[PDB]
Design a protein around this ligand. Sequence first.
Ligand code: C14
Ligand code: C14
Ligand code: D10
Ligand code: D10
Ligand code: D10
Ligand code: OCT
Ligand code: OCT
Ligand code: OCT
Ligand code: OCT
Ligand code: OCT
Lengths: 476, 241
Amino acid sequence: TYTTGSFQLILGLNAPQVISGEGEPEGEVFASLASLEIKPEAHVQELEIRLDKDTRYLTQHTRNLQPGDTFHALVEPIGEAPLPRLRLTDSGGKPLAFGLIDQPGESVELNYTCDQDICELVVHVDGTDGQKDSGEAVYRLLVGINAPNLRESGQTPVGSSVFLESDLVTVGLAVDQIVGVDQRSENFSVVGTLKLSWHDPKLGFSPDQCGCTVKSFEDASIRAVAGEINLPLPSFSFYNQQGNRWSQNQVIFVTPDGRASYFERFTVTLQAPDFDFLAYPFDRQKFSIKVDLAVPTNMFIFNEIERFQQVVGDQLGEEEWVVTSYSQEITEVPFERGSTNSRFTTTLLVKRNLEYYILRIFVPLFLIISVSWVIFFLKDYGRQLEVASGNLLVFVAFNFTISGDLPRLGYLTVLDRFMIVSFCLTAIVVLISVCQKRLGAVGKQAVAAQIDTWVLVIYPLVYSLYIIWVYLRFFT
Amino acid sequence: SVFLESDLVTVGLAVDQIVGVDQRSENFSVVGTLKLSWHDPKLGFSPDQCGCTVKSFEDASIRAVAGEINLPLPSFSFYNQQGNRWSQNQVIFVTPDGRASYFERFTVTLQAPDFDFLAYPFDRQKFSIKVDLAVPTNMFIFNEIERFQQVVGDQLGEEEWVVTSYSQEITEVPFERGSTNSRFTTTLLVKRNLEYYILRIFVPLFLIISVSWVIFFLKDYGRQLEVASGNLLVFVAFNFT
Ligand SMILES: CCCCCCCCCCCCCC
Ligand SMILES: CCCCCCCCCCCCCC
Ligand SMILES: CCCCCCCCCC
Ligand SMILES: CCCCCCCCCC
Ligand SMILES: CCCCCCCCCC
Ligand SMILES: CCCCCCCC
Ligand SMILES: CCCCCCCC
Ligand SMILES: CCCCCCCC
Ligand SMILES: CCCCCCCC
Ligand SMILES: CCCCCCCC
């Protein structure tokens, strides 16, 4: 490949000390720059911009200009959009030029020339004349350096970009194991791996001063390395991190071309305010992992997603939570002190193990309810009363035996409501048994038999109607 | 003005989630955001000495920045903070004119000695969050309240505690070495979920009491005694459940 960088050149004429590399300037000059003999090279760039209702002000940064250079800019609307205002300022905001409306008033033009040793220019395009919400006005912006022919360029954009571009960062994340879910405080913990990669020529170095191909930094965060080497680096954080984060194998290494990458193995706890356990245990939850860059989008921005490993890893044995699907996306979110920062989000859809709850809870409850129902075939009401009294205690014993699988959230779930209804019906069975015993005692066995038939007909219908109502009110 | 004036500070606070209440130690934990803003010409600078419009400090408290730049700054503290406080996105940035602002996302645990659970579970509680400036009122003072977001935020799902109303106020409290310091107080009025307790406790208890009451219609007193003896055990079982 080729190479890039700055250089120092020493030329001598009949001065044998030059080959030592230490020749100090002397005598009268004899050579000069060749490029000064002709007209300088031009760079032209064109961009399309849109001024939304809340984005009526836009600014762009230009590369450094050497003394003697010239700067031109022009703006022309795509359609019937009104002509916006244009002006040029330095990096501090000191005004330098203002746009002029041409006699064919369909465009605004600007011009400037460089005087200082180094000039940094910023172009302002704004349409905040008033407060009208025009909508989707769109304009075409043409800008060039040493290009006085921007009116009729003819050629496609040549040279290099006039405006600075943001550094592109490739990110990737993998989840290894879900290590816990807290249902009262609404947070969960996860173990996984994170990887970042970006290219920056300012970090490149020359091998001949170290005799190596790889330079690495270990056991330090990106912020610490950036503060040590006095260069901007793409720092990040977890948006919903709770407490400190444990990290392993944290390393940053760079190549002489300037390609750098970051690696980390983490165990973190994340807050999840969106949890909803109303449909417990048939609830479905979303595990979202958010990674936000701590720099404005004009410096660094996520560009691509890398799948270095499987996003969700397989492990031996069964799990409490089963992942159904996953997704990854890159978006933009508002940032402090204006501007915008990049966000990388990984979402997991999970559900519980249904067979566990079904076999452990519902079948024994059904059997207890059946025991309470079957006793109405007997015509000896003392035995019926005794068995009902025993079955109520059996129901309470089973309820407190399974109490370990009953979350205490401060609000009702489906299981709690079902248990309450079953307990109420079981107690009503004992009440009806007492009433039938008294009726048989007074000599009205026919009424007791009729009540038995009525209960036998009614109870399963009531249970089925309650189940249908719960399904209607919680699952559709 | 002939006399010196105090610097005016704008304060705002929001609550995102109540993450826990400790009823024996009388403390609770909350997650939220805090924002401060003030104006000071002594912090102003010229752009041509840095080539930038914003000067920023990150991951540092107000006290640390004040010690580093050797200028007085409006430091603050939580009055009833228990243990250390977790902070994220902590940043201070200043404009050339001298306008400064502070931002922080916090998770803190606060002592609440005013808790009263005599009327449990029908009790109502107050959650008070107090922010006090660590400087005398002749240097800095809270002047305005900024509502950058909703004071109480909505979240998916049900909550154990339901917020009925909120309020914000600025007052003055005695300060060490005399003088006075400003205080910013946010109060939340909360109540429990009544349906949970009612349906889970009171209906079964009423049914058990009814079972014990209904047996006096019988004239066979052996059955009545047996059912009463069984119902006492059932009551004990429900109580411990
Ligand atoms: C309540 C527990 C379920 C028991 C099965 C009920 C099936 C419906 C049978 C209805 C029979 C009525 C005979 C008088
Ligand atoms: C104690 C559980 C409540 C049962 C209902 C009582 C209602 C009052 C009825 C009084 C009837 C007296 C008949 C001799
Ligand atoms: C596990 C829930 C069982 C509830 C009672 C079933 C009654 C069905 C009657 C047809
Ligand atoms: C609260 C339940 C009331 C049941 C009353 C039973 C009447 C029985 C008299 C023979
Ligand atoms: C998706 C499964 C729907 C559950 C409806 C019936 C619940 C009965 C009470 C536990
Ligand atoms: C974890 C198994 C899902 C539900 C299976 C139903 C079998 C009772
Ligand atoms: C043999 C027991 C049947 C239990 C059915 C209720 C659970 C789906
Ligand atoms: C929704 C809970 C109702 C509790 C009692 C039902 C008695 C049939
Ligand atoms: C959380 C519900 C408040 C009380 C409702 C009463 C219904 C039994
Ligand atoms: C308010 C709770 C006591 C009444 C329970 C009635 C049960 C049907």
